[PDB]
Enzyme design. Structure first.
Site, PDB file in Angstrom:
ATOM      1  N   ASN A 113      12.060 -10.504 -32.356  1.00  0.00           N
ATOM      2  CA  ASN A 113      12.532 -11.675 -33.024  1.00  0.00           C
ATOM      3  C   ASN A 113      14.050 -11.418 -33.457  1.00  0.00           C
ATOM      4  O   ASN A 113      14.403 -10.336 -34.121  1.00  0.00           O
ATOM      5  CB  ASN A 113      11.824 -12.112 -34.250  1.00  0.00           C
ATOM      6  CG  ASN A 113      12.102 -11.348 -35.470  1.00  0.00           C
ATOM      7  OD1 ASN A 113      12.873 -11.672 -36.420  1.00  0.00           O
ATOM      8  ND2 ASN A 113      11.252 -10.381 -35.659  1.00  0.00           N
ATOM      9  N   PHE A 117      16.920 -15.103 -40.850  1.00  0.00           N
ATOM     10  CA  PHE A 117      16.419 -15.675 -42.142  1.00  0.00           C
ATOM     11  C   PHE A 117      16.714 -17.169 -42.092  1.00  0.00           C
ATOM     12  O   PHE A 117      17.330 -17.890 -43.114  1.00  0.00           O
ATOM     13  CB  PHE A 117      17.662 -15.106 -43.175  1.00  0.00           C
ATOM     14  CG  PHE A 117      17.294 -13.605 -43.887  1.00  0.00           C
ATOM     15  CD1 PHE A 117      16.051 -13.057 -43.645  1.00  0.00           C
ATOM     16  CD2 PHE A 117      18.250 -12.861 -44.311  1.00  0.00           C
ATOM     17  CE1 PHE A 117      15.788 -11.833 -44.091  1.00  0.00           C
ATOM     18  CE2 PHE A 117      18.007 -11.627 -44.855  1.00  0.00           C
ATOM     19  CZ  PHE A 117      16.939 -11.220 -44.666  1.00  0.00           C
ATOM     20  N   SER A 183      16.483  -6.233 -42.726  1.00  0.00           N
ATOM     21  CA  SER A 183      16.765  -7.258 -41.676  1.00  0.00           C
ATOM     22  C   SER A 183      17.673  -6.866 -40.554  1.00  0.00           C
ATOM     23  O   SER A 183      18.746  -6.730 -41.086  1.00  0.00           O
ATOM     24  CB  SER A 183      16.754  -8.755 -42.000  1.00  0.00           C
ATOM     25  OG  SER A 183      16.910  -9.434 -40.776  1.00  0.00           O
ATOM     26  N   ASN A 185      18.901  -8.602 -38.401  1.00  0.00           N
ATOM     27  CA  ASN A 185      19.340  -9.946 -37.723  1.00  0.00           C
ATOM     28  C   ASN A 185      20.418 -10.671 -38.582  1.00  0.00           C
ATOM     29  O   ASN A 185      20.641 -11.982 -38.675  1.00  0.00           O
ATOM     30  CB  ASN A 185      18.109 -10.931 -37.544  1.00  0.00           C
ATOM     31  CG  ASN A 185      17.232 -10.221 -36.651  1.00  0.00           C
ATOM     32  OD1 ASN A 185      17.523  -9.469 -35.536  1.00  0.00           O
ATOM     33  ND2 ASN A 185      15.843 -10.431 -36.801  1.00  0.00           N
ATOM     34  N   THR A 186      20.894 -10.047 -39.990  1.00  0.00           N
ATOM     35  CA  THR A 186      21.801 -10.617 -40.773  1.00  0.00           C
ATOM     36  C   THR A 186      23.068  -9.485 -40.766  1.00  0.00           C
ATOM     37  O   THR A 186      22.677  -8.453 -41.042  1.00  0.00           O
ATOM     38  CB  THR A 186      21.384 -10.776 -42.001  1.00  0.00           C
ATOM     39  OG1 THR A 186      20.330 -11.933 -41.945  1.00  0.00           O
ATOM     40  CG2 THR A 186      22.497 -11.346 -42.952  1.00  0.00           C
ATOM     41  N   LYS A 223      12.290  -2.824 -49.204  1.00  0.00           N
ATOM     42  CA  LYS A 223      11.959  -3.043 -48.032  1.00  0.00           C
ATOM     43  C   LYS A 223      12.905  -2.215 -47.163  1.00  0.00           C
ATOM     44  O   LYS A 223      14.199  -2.730 -47.022  1.00  0.00           O
ATOM     45  CB  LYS A 223      11.534  -4.305 -47.477  1.00  0.00           C
ATOM     46  CG  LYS A 223      10.856  -4.201 -46.191  1.00  0.00           C
ATOM     47  CD  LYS A 223      10.194  -5.528 -45.726  1.00  0.00           C
ATOM     48  CE  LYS A 223       9.376  -5.356 -44.265  1.00  0.00           C
ATOM     49  NZ  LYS A 223       8.832  -6.832 -44.263  1.00  0.00           N
ATOM     50  N   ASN A 252      10.370  -2.295 -42.014  1.00  0.00           N
ATOM     51  CA  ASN A 252      10.850  -3.673 -41.067  1.00  0.00           C
ATOM     52  C   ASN A 252      10.711  -3.472 -39.567  1.00  0.00           C
ATOM     53  O   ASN A 252      10.371  -2.295 -39.196  1.00  0.00           O
ATOM     54  CB  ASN A 252      12.172  -4.019 -41.692  1.00  0.00           C
ATOM     55  CG  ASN A 252      12.536  -5.421 -41.721  1.00  0.00           C
ATOM     56  OD1 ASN A 252      12.039  -6.128 -40.740  1.00  0.00           O
ATOM     57  ND2 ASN A 252      13.078  -6.072 -42.737  1.00  0.00           N
TER      58      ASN A 252
HETATM   59  C1  FMN Z   1       8.724 -13.361 -36.212  1.00  0.00           C
HETATM   60  C2  FMN Z   1       8.839 -12.190 -37.333  1.00  0.00           C
HETATM   61  C3  FMN Z   1       9.770 -12.541 -38.546  1.00  0.00           C
HETATM   62  C4  FMN Z   1       9.605 -11.678 -39.409  1.00  0.00           C
HETATM   63  N1  FMN Z   1      10.399 -12.040 -40.620  1.00  0.00           N
HETATM   64  C5  FMN Z   1      10.590 -11.074 -41.707  1.00  0.00           C
HETATM   65  C6  FMN Z   1      11.238 -11.818 -42.961  1.00  0.00           C
HETATM   66  O1  FMN Z   1      11.631 -12.763 -42.986  1.00  0.00           O
HETATM   67  N2  FMN Z   1      11.365 -10.699 -43.926  1.00  0.00           N
HETATM   68  C7  FMN Z   1      10.961  -9.482 -43.771  1.00  0.00           C
HETATM   69  O2  FMN Z   1      11.082  -8.598 -44.819  1.00  0.00           O
HETATM   70  N3  FMN Z   1      10.335  -8.970 -42.528  1.00  0.00           N
HETATM   71  C8  FMN Z   1      10.419  -9.814 -41.731  1.00  0.00           C
HETATM   72  N4  FMN Z   1       9.385  -9.427 -40.353  1.00  0.00           N
HETATM   73  C9  FMN Z   1       8.909  -8.062 -40.270  1.00  0.00           C
HETATM   74  C10 FMN Z   1       7.570  -7.950 -40.737  1.00  0.00           C
HETATM   75  O3  FMN Z   1       7.328  -8.079 -41.957  1.00  0.00           O
HETATM   76  C11 FMN Z   1       6.947  -6.643 -40.585  1.00  0.00           C
HETATM   77  O4  FMN Z   1       7.904  -5.642 -41.302  1.00  0.00           O
HETATM   78  C12 FMN Z   1       7.229  -6.009 -39.100  1.00  0.00           C
HETATM   79  O5  FMN Z   1       7.176  -7.240 -38.325  1.00  0.00           O
HETATM   80  C13 FMN Z   1       6.228  -4.852 -38.628  1.00  0.00           C
HETATM   81  O6  FMN Z   1       4.738  -5.049 -39.014  1.00  0.00           O
HETATM   82  P1  FMN Z   1       3.923  -5.685 -37.448  1.00  0.00           P
HETATM   83  O7  FMN Z   1       4.230  -4.591 -36.528  1.00  0.00           O
HETATM   84  O8  FMN Z   1       2.713  -5.940 -38.115  1.00  0.00           O
HETATM   85  O9  FMN Z   1       4.664  -7.229 -37.136  1.00  0.00           O
HETATM   86  C14 FMN Z   1       9.225 -10.213 -39.406  1.00  0.00           C
HETATM   87  C15 FMN Z   1       8.843  -9.998 -38.275  1.00  0.00           C
HETATM   88  C16 FMN Z   1       8.455 -10.868 -37.259  1.00  0.00           C
HETATM   89  C17 FMN Z   1       7.586 -10.417 -35.863  1.00  0.00           C
HETATM   90  O1  ORO Z   2      14.519 -13.607 -40.064  1.00  0.00           O
HETATM   91  C1  ORO Z   2      14.562 -12.633 -39.428  1.00  0.00           C
HETATM   92  O2  ORO Z   2      15.155 -12.649 -38.359  1.00  0.00           O
HETATM   93  C2  ORO Z   2      13.984 -11.231 -39.476  1.00  0.00           C
HETATM   94  C3  ORO Z   2      14.140 -10.661 -40.942  1.00  0.00           C
HETATM   95  C4  ORO Z   2      13.543  -9.402 -41.334  1.00  0.00           C
HETATM   96  O3  ORO Z   2      13.621  -9.066 -42.323  1.00  0.00           O
HETATM   97  N1  ORO Z   2      13.003  -8.804 -40.221  1.00  0.00           N
HETATM   98  C5  ORO Z   2      12.927  -9.341 -38.941  1.00  0.00           C
HETATM   99  O4  ORO Z   2      12.194  -8.727 -38.126  1.00  0.00           O
HETATM  100  N2  ORO Z   2      13.315 -10.491 -38.691  1.00  0.00           N
END
Ligand code: FMN
Ligand code: ORO
Ligand code: BVO
Ligand code: LDA
EC number: 1.3.5.2
Length: 363
Positions: A113, A117, A183, A185-186, A223, A252
């Site tokens: 992804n 944000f 993140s 992506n910022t 984080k 993350n």
């Molecule tokens: C679509 C998507 C959006 C995410 N958005 C955020 C986010 O806004 N802030 C954040 O700290 N982590 C975000 N994450 C990261 C997850 O919180 C997590 O740290 C990461 O995906 C690993 O866990 P997983 O393998 O179980 O998905 C996002 C992950 C995915 C897949």
């Molecule tokens: O908003 C997002 O793109 C995002 C934020 C984050 O902390 N981690 C991630 O995978 N995506």
């Protein structure tokens, strides 16, 4: 029962019909409306964890990013999560990156992804949480805490002020806050993980937090990325101990692309989640636990979809775990699955409960 149906039929069909972002939106809507069977799994006492100033009925939480805007909190508890983390939330509303910005890698049980944000902003989320603030107070007392993950706006000049604003506005509504400096992506965000910037930033965050009234004073966690150098990790551990940061969320998504990915979409820009991140995350937990002498609570996240995955992170040093990507493949039944499997493994390995297993690999 429901596990096989969701896993082999329902979820593959949803994925076949809907692009991942549309599927995500539908998932949030269904969850918010409670359109899911109340989880039949009853949490046993050996899954209870006391950490971060709170009781957690079970150690399996929903990771940030699923409910970015705090729209589905109660539905997520109904799904069986022991705690819910919303966000990331930015100070002002912002749209995030242009579409497409989410990609499935089914052959790898992964997602990439680059949302960037997308956020309804602090004000909107503040009012959403206020509408259920006393309900949450009861849930928290009953062992179901709430975390709020804070981000920064794309056009922000002063990142520390963005996080400070988040502490002020949503801190009073959270059991814990997350300073998300990882993140991918910022632009420039992850540089906030550097020692000097991190110390300045977290000093300001903790000052703002300490200024809140006692019953509205959250724990503060940082984080971090899975992509840190050994030096980065040493520095973070040092700053965290120096300042009295309450915990770490590890990790993350990764901007790495591990050898062996099969998904056609593997070379899309963004953060990779799911199984290819699992052991990278677990090792980052292991390292951070050691560097902080086990005295700093860790929430472990990355590629968890089974009791074994959860227990590996717990034994490596995690007090709690989260998942997200597994939901997108297994659906809601994965929560009960992980909890049931975790309980069984704890028994098999001679642990009296989750607490006894935390950091056990180090001993
Ligand atoms: C679509 C998507 C959006 C995410 N958005 C955020 C986010 O806004 N802030 C954040 O700290 N982590 C975000 N994450 C990261 C997850 O919180 C997590 O740290 C990461 O995906 C690993 O866990 P997983 O393998 O179980 O998905 C996002 C992950 C995915 C897949
Ligand atoms: O908003 C997002 O793109 C995002 C934020 C984050 O902390 N981690 C991630 O995978 N995506
Ligand atoms: O690719 C993605 C994806 C990518 C990136 C982020 C998220 C997702 C995501 O959520 C998703 C995907 N593919 N399917 N889903 C999905 C779809 C659902 F409908 C539900 C769901 C929730 C609650 C109740 C019920 C019905 O009982 C179903 C679900 F949990 C997951
Ligand atoms: C050394 C780590 C290398 C990169 C990640 C390793 C992924 C291990 C494979 C388990 C994945 C199960 N599945 C369905 C997703 O293929």
């Amino acid at each position: 029962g429901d596990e096989r149906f969701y896993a082999e039929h329902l979820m593959p069909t949803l994925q076949g019909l809907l692009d991942p972002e549309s599927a995500h939106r539908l998932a949030v809507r269904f969850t918010s409306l409670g359109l899911l069977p109340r989880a039949r799994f009853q949490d046993s006492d050996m899954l209870e964890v006391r950490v971060l100033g709170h009781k957690f009925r079970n150690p399996v939480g929903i990771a940030a990013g699923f409910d970015k805007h705090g729209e589905a909190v109660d539905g997520l508890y109904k799904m069986g999560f022991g705690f819910v983390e919303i966000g990331s939330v930015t100070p002002k509303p912002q749209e995030g990156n242009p579409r497409p910005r989410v990609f499935r890698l089914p052959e790898d049980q992964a997602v990439i992804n680059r949302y960037g944000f997308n956020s309804h902003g602090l004000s909107v989320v503040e009012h959403r949480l206020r509408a259920r603030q006393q309900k949450q107070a009861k849930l928290t007392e009953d062992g179901l805490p709430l975390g709020v993950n804070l981000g920064k706006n794309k056009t922000s000049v002063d990142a520390a002020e963005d996080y400070a604003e988040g502490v002020r506005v949503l801190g009073p509504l959270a059991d814990y806050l997350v300073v998300n400096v990882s993140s991918p992506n910022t632009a420039g965000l992850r540089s906030l993980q550097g020692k000097a910037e991190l110390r300045r930033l977290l000093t300001k965050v903790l000052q703002e937090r300490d200024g809140l009234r006692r019953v509205h004073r959250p724990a503060v966690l940082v984080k971090i990325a899975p992509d840190l150098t050994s030096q980065d990790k040493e520095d973070i551990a040092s700053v965290v101990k120096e300042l009295g940061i309450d915990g770490l969320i590890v990790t993350n998504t990764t901007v790495s692309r591990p050898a062996g990915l099969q998904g056609a979409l593997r070379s899309e820009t963004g953060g990779l989640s799911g199984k290819p991140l699992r052991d990278l995350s677990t090792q980052t937990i292991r390292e951070m636990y050691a560097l902080t002498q086990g005295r700093v609570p860790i929430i472990g996240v990355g590629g968890v979809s089974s009791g074994q995955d959860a227990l590996e992170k717990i034994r490596a040093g995690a007090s709690l775990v989260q998942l997200y990507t597994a939901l997108t493949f297994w659906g809601p039944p994965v929560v009960g699955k992980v909890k049931r499997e975790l309980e069984a493994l704890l028994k098999e390995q001679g642990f009296g409960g989750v607490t006894d297993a935390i950091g056990a690999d180090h001993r």
